[PDB]
Each structure stands twice: as C-alpha cells, then as structure tokens.
Amino acid sequence: VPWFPRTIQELDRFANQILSYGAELDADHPGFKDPVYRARRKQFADIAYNYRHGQPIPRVEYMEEEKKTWGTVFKTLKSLYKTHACYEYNHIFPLLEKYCGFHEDNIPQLEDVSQFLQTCTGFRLRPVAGLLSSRDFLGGLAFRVFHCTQYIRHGSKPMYTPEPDICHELLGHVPLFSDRSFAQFSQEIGLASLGAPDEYIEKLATIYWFTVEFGLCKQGDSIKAYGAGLLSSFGELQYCLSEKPKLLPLELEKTAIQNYTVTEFQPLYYVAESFNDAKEKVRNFAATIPRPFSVRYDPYTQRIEVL
Amino acid sequence: VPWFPRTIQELDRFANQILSYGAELDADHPGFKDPVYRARRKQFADIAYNYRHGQPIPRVEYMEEEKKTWGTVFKTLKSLYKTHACYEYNHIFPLLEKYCGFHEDNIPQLEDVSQFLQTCTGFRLRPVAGLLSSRDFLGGLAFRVFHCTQYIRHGSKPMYTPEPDICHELLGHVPLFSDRSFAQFSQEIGLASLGAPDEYIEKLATIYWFTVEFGLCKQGDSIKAYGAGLLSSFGELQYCLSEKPKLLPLELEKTAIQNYTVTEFQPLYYVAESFNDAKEKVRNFAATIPRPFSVRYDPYTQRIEVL
Ligand SMILES: C[C@H](O)[C@H](O)C1=Nc2c(nc(N)[nH]c2=O)NC1
Ligand SMILES: C[C@H](O)[C@H](O)C1=Nc2c(nc(N)[nH]c2=O)NC1
Ligand SMILES: [Fe+3]
Ligand SMILES: [Fe+3]
C-alpha cells in the first residue's frame, strides 16, 4: 500500500517530489529564449519550495508586463462566462471581483484567494512549483487543498499556455472550488486516491480530466461548462457547447478508461447530471478500488481517519 | 425565534451578556474579605471581556498561593481517577500531563489546553468572565467551543468552590472534551439549543446537568463517572459509585424534567449506555423542540447551516 498523508501538514512532503525540470526549459516554450522570464519562474518556484502548511502564501508584486498578459486573458474570457459557464461560476464571479481583486488590471494574490475559498468551503490553496505526480496532486484534494501555480504564462502568447499558470488556476479552477457541491465532489476524488494502486490512480486522473478539467454539466434543460480547462480556454469554451463535439453521459466505468490528448480540442466530453450525482458516482467507483481499508476526512482535526 | 450565532465569530456577542456581579461579591464567598483576591478576579474577568474569537488566550503568571491551591486539588482528586473515572478520562490524562503541563506544581495555560483539544476533536476554549445564560453557554457547544473560566478558587478552602473555577474546568471538563464521541455528544446538546424556546433551553440545561456535569456511564459490565462535577469533586466522586445514590437509565423524557440542587451530593444519577447512545437520544429529543427550522454545523467554514 503506497504511503499517503494522514494529516494536512503531511502534504509538506510533496514539495520535495516534483519534476525539477519544468516546461519553461523546453525549446518550444513561449519564454524559452527569455532569461528574465526564466529567473521569474525560478523565483516563483522557490516560493512554493519554501512554503509550509499553515503559513500565509507570500504576496508578490507582479510587473506591468505580467498584469497586461493577465488583462488580455481576463478580458477575452470573461465575455463568454455569462452564456457558457455554469450557474455556480457566474454566481461567485461577482464576489471574486469585489473581494479578491479580480480585474483586468490586477492579478489576485493567492493569499486573498485562499482566505476567500476557506470562507466558502474550507478549500485552501498552496503554491506549487511545478507538475506534481497524479497521486500527490489528487491526494491534496482529500484535505480540500488545491496545489496552485503562482507564475504566469509568457507575455508573447497571452492566449496560449502549454501548462497550468495563474490565469488558468484563478479563472478556471477557483470559481468552482467556491461551491459546496463541487468542493465535496472534487474531495471525493481525492479521498478515492489515498493509498490506491498506481493503476487506479491513473484511472482517477482520467476521471478528473473529464470532470474537473473538461467537464460539462446539465443545468435545467441546458448544458454548461464547469471544467477548468474549458473555462480558461477562449476557443474550446465556445467549441464545447457547439454541435461539433460529441457528448456522452458521465459513466465512470467508461470515462475512467477513455483516452485523450492535451494538444487539441476534445472531440468528446462527458456530461454530469450534477455535482452531487458525480460525487456519488465517484464514491461508488472508489469502492471498486483495491484498498485494504476505508478512509474519511475529519475537518475538525484535519486528519484522515483510516478504518 | 430567539437570536443565535450563525458563525463561530458571532460568539463574541456573548461577552457583553453575563451576570456583571459575580459570586466573589457575596458575603459567604471564601474570598469575600480578600481585596487581593477581589482584584485578581477582576483581572481575569477583564481578560475574558477583551478576548475575541481567533486570538490566542492570554497567558497568565499564577502566584505561588494559587499554584498551591491547584496542587492540593490536583493531588487529592488524581488518586481517584484510575478506579472511578471512565476509560476516556484515564486514556487522555497521561497525555495532558505530558503536553499540557498537568502537574500539582503547575497550572496549565488555557492557550495550551485549547490547542491540545483542537488537535483531539476540534474543541477549543474561550476564556469567560463569569456565569453565562444557559442559552449562550450551550450555544457555544454547537461550534465545539467551551466557555472556560481562568480564575481559581480562594486558597482558604481548596477542597471547595461555589462556582466553576479552573480546577473544575481542567480536571473535570477538558479530559472528556478530548474524546471524539463525547465531543459529538456535547455538540448535539449545543445544536439542539440553537433558536430553541426558553422553556426547552431549561430542559436542555437539565439534561446537561445529568450528563456533562454529573453523568455516569456504563463501561463493560461496570459503571464509571464522566460528569465534570463529579470528576472535580473528591467527595461526590467516591459517593457516586457507592450503594448510597439511586441510579436510573438515561431517559430524556424523564431526565429533562428531573429537579436537582447544587448544594449537596446528588441523590439520583442517570447512567448513559455510551456517549454515542446519549447523543442519539439528544438528537431525538431535539426533534421534539418547536423550531421552524433545522440546524447543522459545517466545520469546513465554521458556520451553522439553517434549513
Ligand atoms: C489531475 C491529474 O493527476 C493530472 O495529470 C495533474 N494535474 C496537475 C498536477 N500538478 C499541478 N501542480 N497542477 C495540476 O493542475 N499534476 C498532475
Ligand atoms: C449548562 C447550564 O446552562 C448551566 O446552568 C450553566 N453552566 C455554565 C455557565 N457559564 C459558564 N461560564 N460556565 C458554566 O459551566 N452558564 C449556565
Ligand atoms: Fe487545471
Ligand atoms: Fe462545569
């Protein structure tokens, strides 16, 4: 049985376990030839590397160049939310704009966003240097902890990023983590991953992809997007609700083994009846995972109870 | 419907609602003629009066006279716990002695005790000036918050106190609040009191008296004490498990209306099958309380959800 954190503080062991050679080092990366960008990324990586549970997330003064990139992404995407984003998203966005500083001329500080999420569902953020294993990233969700990037994409291509960056985290993920039902749903995924075999972790990663990242949900007699990858993608967000993509009901037995690529728009999306239904489906799927025990999270003591 | 806190911070409104003329002012009080004691009590009252949710509980340097009083109470009572106190009590006491400084020559600081309880069940302490109404005192339990006194009884009579004092809170209450089952049970009482009519509040106060204060519980084929009033009373603790008092099964419909006095040993005690059973009985009793709504506590956001 693979090791897993029993306390929220134990998530600290995750920092010393990431891909040390990030994407910013790749020749095809938008900022590859930018030494200033290289150092800025390293600066953000060090903040995450030195962060420890409990401490407030270090505030950072973003440069004008970075705020411009943010403004571009903010302005373009926001024009689609009212008609394409699920109710949960639109209901909370006005609140984020007023209490977290969500504006095109300002990049929200993770500390303020984390406090806001805590007040909403107890979800909190932890700055992350780079890509974590699926096991570690999903494990955090069990404690309602989202490993969040703080750096921003390179300014040369504001409408594109080969990795998650702050625009993605804040405009795509955060709004949904402010919803109780979604919070419980995402947490159910995290709980299912604790001590799960590597093979089932990959299955949960795939389920996560078709829900938290590119999921669509029913809303009355309509269908709306709730996936963070869709909500942070101007092109795919409009595409996902057109007649081009194929839509199928969310079915974990099938979804969990569905292949996909992160290079182009998804040809297929899974539609969740609701966040509560999706959560129940995850719970049922979790029961099929070979684990010599059962897990539960106790928010009172922030510990995982192993039975 | 009487007002009640919706957030743990709203408990702050309680400080401005206590009996401003405490027992230390009564002519028959052990320290009535002691001006030094009078001022010491006022000093402790001011700390509670200025305390606000979130802040750490101010540490206080106790005088040698006070530590002596504590040592006397500690030494005498402790000799009875192993044989008279319930398992939950004895299981946690060794831990309190090692991490909270529970020794006869040292009075534990409430801040350390609160941190300890939080790690155990999420229960926390809040210093309280004097006697709170039953509604306010029980309301706090809904948030797993115990209003705790910080002052100590007068040194002239270490084996006696006409009110709750720190020896009572720490040696009687605290150990039980470190148990998950008891924690949930006591909280169930607090939840039942939220917005309850004055008459049912008195009923919950009576139930509390026969459980949290002077309750006995079954333990295997034996019976042990768990009530804080018994655990902090050398005389009654031995008495409660002898053949003199009358014992009856815990039955809220009867217990809730049973009369009692706080001047002499209880002639009758109610025996709980267990803390979980008692909690279920409270829940059922709570359903009989005329309330145009249902309540639930969300530890994730520390708010009461009203349905
Ligand atoms: C969720 C699934 O495990 C997916 O492959 C991952 N996403 C992320 C990750 N790590 C970070 N920091 N952020 C992500 O969004 N590691 C793995
Ligand atoms: C529990 C029942 O409401 C009982 O009358 C009370 N106990 C207490 C109280 N207030 C304090 N501060 N401490 C207690 O132990 N107010 C009322
Ligand atoms: Fe993402
Ligand atoms: Fe008491």
Nearest to B26 by CA among B37, B10, B18: B37
DSSP state of A109: P
Phi-psi region of B58 (alpha: psi -120 to 50; beta: other; left: phi over 0): beta
Concatenate the DSSP letters of all residues of A216-262 into one string. Answer: EEEETTEEEE--HHHHT-HHHHHHTTSSSSEEEE--HHHHTT----S
- For position B206, which CATH number holds? 1.10.800.10
| CB of A132 shorter than 6 A to ligand 1 | yes
Is the four-CA dihedral A296, A299, A300, A302 of positive or negative sign? positive
- Decide: B127 and B82 in contact? Cβ < 8 Å: no
Whole-angstrom distance, CA of residue B15 vs CA of residue B123:
19
Q: Closest chain B residue to A115 measured between Cα atoms?
A: B301
Best residue among A24, A134, A168, A214 to mutate for probing ligand 1, ranked by most atoms within 8 Å of CB: A134
Nearest to B212 by CA among B77, B57, B86, B78: B86
Buried-state track A273-297, b at ≥16 Cβ within 10 A, e below 16: eebeebbebbeebbeebebeeebeb
Note which residues in 110-129 of chain A have CB less than 8 A from chain B.
118-122
Our answer to whether residue B253 is catalytic in this structure is no
- In angstroms, what separates the C-alpha of A301 from chain B's closest C-alpha? 5
Whole-angstrom distance, CA of residue A289 vs CA of residue A307:
15
Best residue among B131, B138, B146 to mutate for probing ligand 2, ranked by most atoms within 8 Å of CB: B131
- Decide: A109 and A126 in contact? Cβ < 8 Å: no
Neighbours of A199 (CB within 10 A): 9
Q: What is the number of domains present in chain A? A: 1
Nearest to A157 by CA among A304, A269, A37: A37
DSSP state of B55: S
Beta bridge partners of A231: none
Neighbours of A23 (CB within 10 A): 17
**What residue owns the CA closest to ligand 2's atom 16?**
B132
Q: Closest chain A residue to B116 measured between Cα atoms?
A: A301
- Decide: A98 and A106 in contact? Cβ < 8 Å: no
Whole-angstrom distance, CA of residue A277 vs CA of residue A252:
12
Is residue A168 annotated as involved in ligand binding?
A: yes
Q: Are strands A222-225 and A216-219 parallel, antiparallel or unpaired?
A: antiparallel
- Decide: B48 and B15 in contact? Cβ < 8 Å: yes
* Residue B209 DSSP SS3: helix
Please report, for residues A210, A247, B260, the alpha-carbon distance to residue A268 in angstroms, rounded to integers and kept in the order given.
9, 6, 70
∠ CA B225-B230-B236, nearest 5°, is 110
DSSP state of B219: E
Domain that holds residue B162: 1-307
Nearest to A10 by CA among A297, A286, A213, A307: A297
Please report, for residues A229, A244, A265, B66, B132, the alpha-carbon distance to residue A262 in angstroms, rounded to integers and kept in the order given.
10, 18, 8, 69, 61
Neighbours of B27 (CB within 10 A): 6
Structure tokens belonging to residue A56:
């407030």
- Tokens 């039953």 found at: B134
Q: What is the resolution of this structure in A?
A: 2.1
- In angstroms, what separates the C-alpha of A119 from chain B's closest C-alpha? 5
Note which residues in 125-154 of chain A have CB less than 8 A from chain B.
144
Is the four-CA dihedral A301, A194, A127, A122 of positive or negative sign? negative
